[PDB]
């Protein structure tokens, strides 16, 4: 067998379709091996360092691999190695990537409609940003549509509970599109239609944002996204026309969620807890959720609980519709100070509201919200329906 | 080729990285074979009977297998064979498991963040509990977090329509956590943060419970869970802080769903039909859904229909919010006797209620609910809005 791709490049096939065995990609590693088939005439093909290897006399060895690629095929070593380049080659390869293990990277870009990534769990199959890297661990570029990101973790320096972060990092960024193509869904140039699903992905341990979807991107679907341990903002969205189902964000130093300039969004099933988490040392108050400058939002079946300051702050927003909403036991950083929903120059229709303050119910004495609603201005038009005061006994008269 | 792993254990390599072909795991079967590679220095590697095989001389043979394991790698035979140990070895292996076929098991435990399981369908790829086994077919242990269970069946004795059950069986049990770790998500000891996803899993044919999530577990997500043919209770949950989407439970001898001591839960999209199923012979009335001793629940877009007794019984519960609810044509075991929603010492806000009783509409004469609402106590605080009486013609004056 050939002992490495370096030797494969020095091995000329003598017959078309010739089978060769590659022991491993890189000498002494036993990783990334496989069977390859030769094309004597290799014009048209480009060496990519893992599934198309070209020889000195211009043949192409083709890896026999019907479906997805994995970083080991392109030279990844796992462990403490920097696997950025092999991961980047996978997503650029022309096929979906499967993550089979944990791989350190610095920054990765998804560019094509083939740049899907699949794992097998929210922890063990993962990309992990190297400690000295800054910026976005994964960026979805405006040329990338119709992909799936499914069942893997995106972890940063602070991923483990109670640990410190690398400044200036983001887990997944969706960049603002710079143009509009006219050949969707076959486009290869900038286009606003992301039309992609992020499903069962776990983001943890970044500084600025877990997930940050910038303005101008349509139909970024999330489903069962799980974000935790973010030094600042768990999830930011600044765009229009999307649906998220079953989002969960937990333990953020500032907001769990920022909606800023959003429109025509749906959130269906969500849990935002432990925002403004005091050990993360953020200076100042931030709510569990900011809804700012937004409009035509439908937010159903969410909960905001155990946040250090206000629950939900709705500001300068029109036509916010919420149906089934649980906010309780926020204001945890100073007792009897903060409120579960704060309205400022906004209009909202809230139905199915509940909010049993479990600290008042148990009589624990733990810090909790002074009450459910605060109006910071008198020009809001708001309706609220539901169980505004729960009706438990009141062991501590509150 | 080596004829069996037993032979492989008696085959010393004489060159590091040496390739060997294994025809099959166990003699005669033609299953579980593949290519392996030698480590002459075996130490620090443990025989696991499918992917790491140690020789009498201390070398390790390592299966060439980048991604998921399957039970056939570890000696499973399929068909009528008890594959419990092969399947247990997979979920213990350090990688996710793929089920490629139906395997009989007695009882499996999921213990690690690597213990994911994937199939390719809600039926053909499955675990099937042996008629000789009792207890939990799958137990998720309190050390197991961040896994995915996706697209496979979990079947017991009664899975086929109209068949009998083995006493004392449960499909999937999530045990009560015995401790709290301080290094999530990298924990290896008990923790309440399950943070896992059960997606497109079909549970059928168990005695006591299809799915039973015990108290103290956070964020067990379910997505497109299908439970049917359960002798007693389709799904029981007794915990807090979770979301389920598109749950369907069909044909249970007692309740389709028990929420007992739940809080801060969301169910979005659900159908619970044919509870208190008379052929399963249970003694007594059980509702489609029991909500007992619960609080701060948001339950949107569900349907309870065709159940033998009451539709939904809400008892000793605070702050139950329901937005979009369909209950009709329950009480099928005795005409004109049972009610679609029964309130007992509970508070609730129900919006977007509908309940066209299709049997009264068609004039079939089939047994159905006496009416939509019954109050067993007068200390309830309840708001109900929607279409309380549908307004069809009334062929039989009802
Ligand atoms: Cl909804």
With helix as H, strand as E and coil as C, how does chain A read? Answer: CECCHHHHCCCCCCCCCCEEEECCCCCCCCCCCEEEEEECCCCCCCCCCCCEEECCCCCEEEECCCCCECHHHHCCCCCCCECHHHHHHHHCCCCCEECCCEEEECCEEECCCCCCEECCCCCCCEEEECCCCCEEEEEECCCCCCCEEEEEEEECCCCCCCCCCCCCEEEEEECCCCCCCCCCCCCCCCCCEEEEEEEEEEEECCCCEEEEECCCCEEEEEECCEEEEECCEEEEECCEEEEEEEEEEEEECCCCEEEECCEEEEEEEEEEECCCCHHHCCCCCCCCEEEECCECEEEEEEEEECCCCCCEEEECCCCEEEEEEEEECCCCCCCCCCEEEEEECCEEEEEEEECCCHHHHHCCCCCCCCEEEEECCCCCEEEEEECCCCCCCCCCCC
b/e per residue, A173-189, with b = 16+ CB within 10 A?
bbbebeeebeeeeebee
Does A266 reach chain B within 8 Å, measured CB to CB? no
Instruction: Say how far apart CA A87 and CA A68 lie, in whole Å.
Output: 13
Residue B114 per-residue DSSP state: T
Q: Which of A387, A388, A394 to mutate: most B Cβ within 10 Å? A: A387
Instruction: Say how far apart CA A307 and CA B160 lie, in whole Å.
Output: 48
Cβ–Cβ gap A30/B62 under 8 Å: yes
Element (H, E) at B326: strand B320-328
Q: Taking phi first (over 0 means left), then psi (-120 to 50 degrees means alpha), and beta for anything else, what does residue B24 get?
A: beta
- What is the β-pairing status of strands A233-237 and A218-223? unpaired
Tell me phi and psi for residue A105, to 5 degrees. -145, 170
Instruction: Say how far apart CA A179 and CA A183 lie, in whole Å.
Output: 13
- The verdict on whether omega for the bond into residue B114 sits within 30 degrees of 0, i.e. cis, is no
Instruction: Say how far apart CA B76 and CA B101 lie, in whole Å.
Output: 11
Centre of ligand 1 from the C-alpha of residue A268, in Å: 6
- Among A100, A162, A324, whose Cβ lies nearest the Cβ of B182? A162
Instruction: Say how far apart CA A347 and CA A96 lie, in whole Å.
Output: 44
Q: Which residues contact A397 (CB under 8 A, 6 or more apart)?
A: none
By CA distance, what is A356's nearest residue in B?
Answer: B296
Number of helices and strands in chain B (H, E): 3, 28
Q: Take residue A144 and report the two structure tokens written for it.
A: 């990338």
Are residues B317 and A350 in contact, defined by beta-carbon separation less than 8 angstroms?
no
Instruction: Say how far apart CA B206 and CA B128 lie, in whole Å.
Output: 10
Instruction: Say how far apart CA B100 and CA A101 lie, in whole Å.
Output: 21
DSSP string computed for B258-309: EEES-EEEEEEEEEEES-S-GGG--SS---SEEEES-EEEEEEEEEEES-SS
Q: Take residue B198 and report the two structure tokens written for it.
A: 């059960």
- Among B17, B113, B347, whose Cβ lies nearest the Cβ of A391? B347
- Among A121, A204, A271, whose Cβ lies nearest the Cβ of B241? A271
Closest CA to A337 of A371, A363, A311: A371
By CA distance, what is B66's nearest residue in A?
Answer: A100
Element (H, E) at B380: none
Asked if residue A223 belongs to a known ligand binding site, the reply is yes
Cβ–Cβ gap A301/B298 under 8 Å: yes
Instruction: Say how far apart CA B154 and CA B125 lie, in whole Å.
Output: 9
Classify B85 as helix, strand or coil: helix
Task: Kindly report the number of other CB atoms within 10 A of residue A370's CB atom.
Answer: 15
Closest CA to B398 of A10, A205, B389: B389
Residue B176 per-residue DSSP state: P
Classify B90 as helix, strand or coil: helix
Cβ–Cβ gap A121/B67 under 8 Å: no
Closest CA to A194 of A226, A242, A150: A242
Cβ-based contacts of B379 with chain A (< 8 Å):
none
**DSSP bridge partners of B9:** none
Are residues A123 and A129 in contact, defined by beta-carbon separation less than 8 angstroms?
no
Does B120 reach chain A within 8 Å, measured CB to CB? no
Does B197 reach chain A within 8 Å, measured CB to CB? yes
Does A98 reach chain B within 8 Å, measured CB to CB? yes
Residue located via tokens 């067998």: A1
Cβ-based contacts of B316 with chain A (< 8 Å):
none
Cβ–Cβ gap A387/B349 under 8 Å: yes
Judged on CB neighbours under 10 Å (0-12, 13-18, 19+), B138 is buried
Cβ-based contacts of A161 with chain B (< 8 Å):
182-185
Are residues A352 and B349 in contact, defined by beta-carbon separation less than 8 angstroms?
yes
* Angle made by CA atoms B256, B259, B265, in degrees to the nearest 5: 115
Centre of ligand 1 from the C-alpha of residue B379, in Å: 29
Cβ–Cβ gap A70/B68 under 8 Å: no
Resolution (A): 1.9
- Among B118, B145, B347, whose Cβ lies nearest the Cβ of A120? B118
Are residues B272 and B307 in contact, defined by beta-carbon separation less than 8 angstroms?
yes
Instruction: Say how far apart CA A359 and CA A368 lie, in whole Å.
Output: 7
The CA-based dihedral angle spanning residues A283, A289, A294, A296, taken in that order and rounded to the nearest 10 degrees: 180
- What is the β-pairing status of strands A320-328 and A347-354? parallel
Are residues B201 and B223 in contact, defined by beta-carbon separation less than 8 angstroms?
no
Query: Is the Cα torsion angle B179, B181, B184, B188 positive or negative in sign?
Result: negative
Instruction: Say how far apart CA A332 and CA A152 lie, in whole Å.
Output: 32
Q: Which of B264, B317, B345, B380 to mutate: most A Cβ within 10 Å? A: B264
Residue B316 per-residue DSSP state: S
- What is the β-pairing status of strands B60-63 and B52-54? antiparallel
Length of chain A: 398
Method: X-ray
Instruction: Say how far apart CA B53 and CA A272 lie, in whole Å.
Output: 47
Cβ–Cβ gap A352/B95 under 8 Å: no
Instruction: Say how far apart CA B282 and CA A40 lie, in whole Å.
Output: 73
Residue located via tokens 């008042």: A360
Centre of ligand 1 from the C-alpha of residue A226, in Å: 19
Centre of ligand 1 from the C-alpha of residue A333, in Å: 31
* Edge-to-edge strands, sheet with A371-375: A108-110, A135-140, A169-174, A209-213, A233-237, A257-260, A289-292, A312-315, A339-344, A371-375
Centre of ligand 1 from the C-alpha of residue A242, in Å: 15
Task: Kindly report the number of other CB atoms within 10 A of residue A66's CB atom.
Answer: 5
Are residues B135 and B170 in contact, defined by beta-carbon separation less than 8 angstroms?
yes
Classify B250 as helix, strand or coil: strand
Instruction: Say how far apart CA A177 and CA B91 lie, in whole Å.
Output: 43
Does B15 reach chain A within 8 Å, measured CB to CB? no
Instruction: Say how far apart CA B98 and CA B334 lie, in whole Å.
Output: 46
Asked if residue A379 belongs to a known ligand binding site, the reply is no
Centre of ligand 1 from the C-alpha of residue B244, in Å: 12
Element (H, E) at B88: helix B84-91
Cβ–Cβ gap A303/B17 under 8 Å: no
Are residues B361 and B329 in contact, defined by beta-carbon separation less than 8 angstroms?
no
Cβ–Cβ gap B186/A160 under 8 Å: yes
Q: Take residue A127 and report the two structure tokens written for it.
A: 């990309």
List C-alpha distances in Å: A45 to A62, A265, B125: 9, 43, 39
Q: Take residue B196 and report the two structure tokens written for it.
A: 């896992």
Does A29 reach chain B within 8 Å, measured CB to CB? no
By CA distance, what is A31's nearest residue in B?
Answer: B66
Cβ–Cβ gap A303/B300 under 8 Å: no
CB pairs under 8 A between A and B: 180
**DSSP bridge partners of A279:** none
């Amino acid at each position: 067998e050939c002992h490495s791709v370096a030797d494969l490049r020095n091995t000329e096939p003598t017959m078309d379709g010739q089978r060769i065995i590659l022991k491993q990609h890189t000498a002494g590693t036993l990783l990334g091996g496989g069977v390859f088939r030769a094309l004597i005439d290799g014009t048209g093909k480009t060496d990519n360092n893992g599934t198309v290897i070209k020889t000195v006399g211009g043949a192409a060895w083709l890896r026999v691999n019907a479906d997805r690629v994995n970083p080991f095929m392109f030279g990844a070593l796992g462990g403490s190695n920097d696997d950025t380049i092999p991961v980047q080659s996978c997503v650029d390869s022309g096929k979906a990537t499967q993550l089979t293990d944990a791989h350190y990277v610095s920054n990765i870009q998804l560019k094509y409609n083939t740049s899907s990534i699949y794992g097998s769990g929210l922890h063990y199959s993962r990309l992990h940003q190297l400690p000295s890297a800054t910026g976005n661990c994964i960026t979805i570029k405006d040329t990338c549509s119709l992909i799936v990101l499914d069942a893997f973790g995106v972890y940063g320096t602070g991923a483990q509970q109670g640990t410190s972060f690398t400044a200036g990092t983001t887990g997944i960024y969706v960049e603002t599109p710079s143009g509009l193509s006219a050949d969707y869904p076959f486009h290869t140039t900038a286009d606003p239609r992301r039309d992609l699903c992020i499903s069962k992905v776990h983001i943890a341990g970044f500084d600025e944002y877990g997930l940050n979807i910038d303005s101008g991107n349509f139909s970024v679907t999330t489903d069962s996204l799980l974000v935790n341990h973010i030094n600042q903002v768990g999830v930011r969205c600044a765009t229009t026309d999307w649906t998220w189902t079953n989002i969960q964000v937990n333990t953020c130093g500032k907001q769990c969620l920022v909606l800023d300039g959003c429109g025509n969004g749906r959130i269906i099933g969500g849990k935002f807890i432990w925002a403004n988490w005091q050990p993360y040392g953020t200076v100042g108050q931030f709510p569990g959720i900011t809804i700012n400058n937004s409009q035509n939002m439908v937010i159903n079946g969410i909960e905001v609980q155990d946040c250090g300051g206000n629950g939900i702050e709705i500001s300068e927003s029109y036509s916010i519709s919420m149906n089934g909403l649980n906010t309780n036991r926020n204001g945890i950083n100073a007792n009897n100070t903060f409120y579960n929903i704060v309205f400022n120059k906004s209009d909202a229709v809230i139905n199915g509201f509940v909010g049993l303050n479990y600290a008042a119910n148990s009589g624990s004495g733990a810090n909790s919200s002074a009450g459910n609603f605060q109006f910071l201005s008198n020009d809001c038009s708001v309706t609220i329906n539901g169980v505004v005061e729960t009706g438990y006994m009141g062991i501590n008269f509150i």
